[PDB]
Amino acid sequence: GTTYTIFGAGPAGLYTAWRLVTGGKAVAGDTIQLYEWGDYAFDGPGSGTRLPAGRIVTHFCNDDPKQSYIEAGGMRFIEWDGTKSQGHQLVTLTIQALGLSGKVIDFNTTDNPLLFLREEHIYQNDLATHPAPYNTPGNNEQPAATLFSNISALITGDAPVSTRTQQCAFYGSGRLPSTFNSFVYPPGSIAGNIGYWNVFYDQAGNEGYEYAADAGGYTSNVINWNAANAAVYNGEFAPGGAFKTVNGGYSQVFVQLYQQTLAAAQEAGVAFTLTQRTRLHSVWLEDDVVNYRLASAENPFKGGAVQTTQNAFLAMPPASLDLVAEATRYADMPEGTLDILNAEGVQLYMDGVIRQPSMRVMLFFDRPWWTDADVPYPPDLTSDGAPNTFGPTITDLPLRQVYYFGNNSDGTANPVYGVLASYDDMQYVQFWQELEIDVGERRKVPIDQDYQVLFGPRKATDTMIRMVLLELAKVHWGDPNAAHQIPWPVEAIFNDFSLNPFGAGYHAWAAHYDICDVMQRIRQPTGLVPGATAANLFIIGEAYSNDQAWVEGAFCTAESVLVDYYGMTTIADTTNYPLICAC
Amino acid sequence: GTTYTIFGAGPAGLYTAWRLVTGGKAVAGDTIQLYEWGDYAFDGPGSGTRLPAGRIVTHFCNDDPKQSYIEAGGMRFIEWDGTKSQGHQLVTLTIQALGLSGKVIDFNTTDNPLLFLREEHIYQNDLATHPAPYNTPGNNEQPAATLFSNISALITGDAPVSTRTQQCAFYGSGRLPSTFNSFVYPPGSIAGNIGYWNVFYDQAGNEGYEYAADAGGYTSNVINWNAANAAVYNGEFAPGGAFKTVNGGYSQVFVQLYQQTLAAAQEAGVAFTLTQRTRLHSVWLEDDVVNYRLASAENPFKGGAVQTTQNAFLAMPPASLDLVAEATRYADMPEGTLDILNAEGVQLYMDGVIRQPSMRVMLFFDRPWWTDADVPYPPDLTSDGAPNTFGPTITDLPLRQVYYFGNNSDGTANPVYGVLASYDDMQYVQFWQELEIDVGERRKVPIDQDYQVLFGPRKATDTMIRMVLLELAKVHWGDPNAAHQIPWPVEAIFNDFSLNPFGAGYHAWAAHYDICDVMQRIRQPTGLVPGATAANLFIIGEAYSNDQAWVEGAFCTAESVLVDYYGMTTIADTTNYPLICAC
Numbered sequence A, B: 001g002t003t004y005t006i007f008g009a010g011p012a013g014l015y016t017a018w019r020l021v022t023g024g025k026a027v028a029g030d031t032i033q034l035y036e037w038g039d040y041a042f043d044g045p046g047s048g049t050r051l052p053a054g055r056i057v058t059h060f061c062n063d064d065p066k067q068s069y070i071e072a073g074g075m076r077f078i079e080w081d082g083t084k085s086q087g088h089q090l091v092t093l094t095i096q097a098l099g100l101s102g103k104v105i106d107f108n109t110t111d112n113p114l115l116f117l118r119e120e121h122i123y124q125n126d127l128a129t130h131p132a133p134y135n136t137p138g139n140n141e142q143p144a145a146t147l148f149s150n151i152s153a154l155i156t157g158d159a160p161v162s163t164r165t166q167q168c169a170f171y172g173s174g175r176l177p178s179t180f181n182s183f184v185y186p187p188g189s190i191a192g193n194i195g196y197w198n199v200f201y202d203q204a205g206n207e208g209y210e211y212a213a214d215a216g217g218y219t220s221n222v223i224n225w226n227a228a229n230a231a232v233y234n235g236e237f238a239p240g241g242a243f244k245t246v247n248g249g250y251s252q253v254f255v256q257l258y259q260q261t262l263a264a265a266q267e268a269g270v271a272f273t274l275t276q277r278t279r280l281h282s283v284w285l286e287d288d289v290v291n292y293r294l295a296s297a298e299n300p301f302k303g304g305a306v307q308t309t310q311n312a313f314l315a316m317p318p319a320s321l322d323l324v325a326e327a328t329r330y331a332d333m334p335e336g337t338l339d340i341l342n343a344e345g346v347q348l349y350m351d352g353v354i355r356q357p358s359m360r361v362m363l364f365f366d367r368p369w370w371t372d373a374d375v376p377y378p379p380d381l382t383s384d385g386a387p388n389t390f391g392p393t394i395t396d397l398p399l400r401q402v403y404y405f406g407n408n409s410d411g412t413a414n415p416v417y418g419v420l421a422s423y424d425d426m427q428y429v430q431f432w433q434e435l436e437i438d439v440g441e442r443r444k445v446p447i448d449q450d451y452q453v454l455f456g457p458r459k460a461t462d463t464m465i466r467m468v469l470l471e472l473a474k475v476h477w478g479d480p481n482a483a484h485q486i487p488w489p490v491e492a493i494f495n496d497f498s499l500n501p502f503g504a505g506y507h508a509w510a511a512h513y514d515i516c517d518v519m520q521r522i523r524q525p526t527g528l529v530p531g532a533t534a535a536n537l538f539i540i541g542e543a544y545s546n547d548q549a550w551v552e553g554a555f556c557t558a559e560s561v562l563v564d565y566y567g568m569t570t571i572a573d574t575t576n577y578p579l580i581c582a583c
């Protein structure tokens, strides 16, 4: 029979295993072996150190599955709308196929976010009468979204950028219009070769860019990524749709993928195993044969015996690929082998994305203190005639965004009220990292070897809690001394996604890349080595997807490999929804 | 005889060889072997791709040694004042010993810098007339230096912090005073376990931090480094002295170290060899024996046969040590060996610094356009009662500082006028990197394999030049359309110090480290490994020094190793000048 070897039991790896079994590619006598560096709880409470999987982690207060939770990784999705050909199609189909559609609930955000900008408090609806304190004439009396839409329209001109296929085409063929007005960028410049921040800065000035970066919504990405993709993902015609979440947490999607793959595998006579605390150490090819070594979590740098497979999936992000590639980069390899991950074209294409570091502080309170009548600037979470919302509040601080989940339990547990504090971007990674160690302690673990998110949300230090309460005091009172009015959290924990093996909260397509060509060709990296024998060794996950902010992208790259390289029938309707861009 | 093997012919490795020969440690029949990954011009025109050495690189316009030049790397030093015991002692002594004292000139800075902040132009002298556009009451009417001094005084309290010994002592034992007023940090907290930006932000708010980060002078440093060291190095009582530079370029120091070491070695009967385009690939120990492999610059990841030495100096920065450690981290090492750089204590102490990325754009003009009478906001490089100066101009843009070197040529008939544009910090690395590739082209070199500074300053793309002229037009005219008035540069080149093998412009001691213990013990890393046989393998350079901004720190750590481990008599007077901190 046939063995399918999957390295990484994140969303992409779990989805792959589930499709091979339920789609009937893996038949009685076949083997699917899943290897995961971490030790996730797939088999209920006590079966792991955190819920699955990868950068999705539902965190229950007190690790009590009946309690309020905060998503310490990915938190929401966009429901597929087949009439609009918009939304997370594979996520929506997968939730339905797993029997979880009944648990889908609205994720409501406020129409009127509090903006805390240069020590001013402005509810976004008041910008016409209380201009934002940025020297950007016109723009400062409008929500940042208006400036986003205006900058996108200066880049896309009259190009069609409304459909997913049109957006994909703009990545490769999109040019600045004949009317582009710039000292720096000529009309007709290839937009894929331009940095988004570079051109936003050119067109709107430092104050226009800073306002957009500080006051913009969660889903508008202002890093210096590919301007062609950024323009179509931040513009008037950006993909949208209704935000939803899975009541009880996103992590149950990954528990169910595992459990239902195992039950379907038993019915089909397929051998499906998950081996945790076991990482891919090194990988290489001998013609079509994938050679690999594993390492234990206890001793992650030391390989075991050389193993072979004909089918290998690297279901892991760039920083994770880098650690594997480092194990052969400097090695004297056996005669007639191909050190595939270190081939020039593979390395070049792996650099087709840039990295955004992220840190999430999760705090549970015994009361929703932000709703008290005497809070000077409460978050605008519940308008009359509309539903309740989770915020956010949006700031120019290190603590750039706050969500207020409150009591999201079934209400049977002792009520606690959750807050999510978001820290992001290269600017701030060194700011938050020193809060991760107690003020009475020296560092003990080399930073590159602290696999904190892999293990689970880490207890917040007293310094970390006090910093979050100081920033929330400035946001909601405008007085740092008001931190004394905030009750001390009953639990506070963090996830620092900049740490290995994740190395990033988010990936974004880089300037100076043909995105469609990287999306197409990086999946089977032998294709990037002239004269190499084809091997069924694949790279999958959200990082090289067309949906980088989302589990959808991890599913879509995985689906595209099953379709293109295993001839499987897609579960999606791709007529208006290319899983990845075609060139 | 005795063989001394030095990996890295930057300032530290060159200084080490020079002292071994001229100090009479290496005697007739001994050998000194220097290996350098790069190919620096030690032997005049035609002998390399750039002037020596490491992160010091004088760049002459059009490669004409009689033209104007800009320091594309380190640019100035503080002359030693033996009376006050203030300044860069080893740099001053070395320049004198090499016969270069006659080339030392003042490096003067304006006392009235032009500030370009949130689209406002303010000469620093006018901040009482026109406060800085930051909502930081009082602070915004005074130079940023006053706020830096005030924060330092809140951290240091009554502790003496004027001497090197007392500053060193504050790193390890310095506590916040009993009067420290903070929600986040208790009185008496260990300052070395606090991030400087974290506590600056706590005490001065985001608008006080931003004003200090944006308007602070040349040497001011707001990154989140060790608060004990930052408080004493940003304080009113920061290390001072008169700023100087070497007319004709700092690179001649390193040319002369090499040439004079070779001459002295030939006279002494010491065999002194510099082997360029040849890197240390991997290193390890067998008892006291240093085992290593070398790699060619052509094939930098493939080691040759195993070599040995009894005396080995790793004269290279953290990012360079990291690349050597990667070559053995994942390897199955020979029986009875110690993989020294991957030992837990060594890895921990290597993380005792954080990295600051830097990019320098060097632009030569055919006339000093910034002095033209119709320029709205010229730099104040003249003053009625002061000598002329190099600037800077200080901004809140990606282009954070500008220096104006003008005509420093030595005998050309057509002099050019030079400008240095500084981009720094984790915030902006991704902003500047996409300007490094032509807007018509895709990226062709994997980013971690683009050894740009090692080869030499790279031609600025037309996009990079137009970006810099746009920012200079905003600064000096307050109109981005004025970029058309700036003459196109004669030559424009850049150095991106974030790239391998440097991986940083600057290193800074990290919070949550005992600085003195790292400074002392990282130099001979076997001392960090319980049970290890002692070996003469050393780590030297500016990164783990007490003078991290400076060539002085490379010389000091090198000197400290020759004194402590080779029993050499120091050339310094250490009475009031510890080479490194004592614990």
Ligand SMILES: Cc1cc2nc3c(=O)[nH]c(=O)nc-3n(C[C@H](O)[C@H](O)[C@H](O)COP(=O)(O)OP(=O)(O)OC[C@H]3O[C@@H](n4cnc5c(N)ncnc54)[C@H](O)[C@@H]3O)c2cc1C
Pocket: A007, A008, A009, A010, A011, A012, A013, A035, A036, A037, A038, A053, A054, A055, A056, A072, A073, A074, A075, A076, A077, A278, A279, A280, A281, A315, A316, A317, A320, A321, A324, A358, A360, A454, A497, A501, A502, A504, A505, A506, A540, A541, A542, A543, A548, A549, A550, A551, A552, A553, A554
């Ligand atoms: C702060 C944050 C918020 C997010 N919010 C959302 C959101 O609201 N909605 C949403 O849909 N998405 C969200 N995402 C994105 C979502 O988390 C990712 O798209 C998704 O987790 C990607 O899945 P993946 O399988 O590609 O990678 P990962 O989740 O990174 O999983 C990779 C797996 O590979 C493992 N691995 C790595 N190296 C090895 C090795 N050598 N051998 C074996 N295993 C290894 C890892 O331990 C991990 O389990 C968010 C992400 C972050 C960081």
Ligand SMILES: Cc1cc2nc3c(=O)[nH]c(=O)nc-3n(C[C@H](O)[C@H](O)[C@H](O)COP(=O)(O)OP(=O)(O)OC[C@H]3O[C@@H](n4cnc5c(N)ncnc54)[C@H](O)[C@@H]3O)c2cc1C
Pocket: B007, B008, B009, B010, B011, B012, B013, B035, B036, B037, B038, B053, B054, B055, B056, B072, B073, B074, B075, B076, B077, B278, B279, B280, B281, B315, B316, B317, B320, B321, B324, B358, B360, B454, B497, B501, B502, B504, B505, B506, B540, B541, B542, B543, B548, B549, B550, B551, B552, B553, B554
């Ligand atoms: C923007 C900037 C401005 C500065 N301004 C000043 C200033 O004004 N004055 C001042 O005094 N200092 C200044 N400095 C600092 C100065 O450049 C450094 O202190 C100094 O260069 C450090 O010397 P080093 O020998 O420790 O390291 P480096 O200069 O980094 O040299 C290390 C050497 O090791 C080599 N190497 C690396 N890996 C290997 C390998 N595996 N095998 C062999 N060789 C290898 C490198 O190629 C390099 O030649 C500045 C630095 C920067 C980036």
Ligand SMILES: NC(=[NH2+])NCCC[C@H](N)C(=O)O
Pocket: A074, A075, A076, A218, A219, A220, A221, A233, A549, A550
């Ligand atoms: N389509 C986008 N670019 N979305 C931006 C990121 C949203 C993010 N995944 C979240 O937590 O909701």
Ligand SMILES: NC(=[NH2+])NCCC[C@H](N)C(=O)O
Pocket: B074, B075, B076, B218, B219, B220, B221, B356, B506, B549, B550
């Ligand atoms: N990280 C920094 N702020 N570095 C700048 C320090 C001073 C710098 N070496 C000089 O040329 O004078």
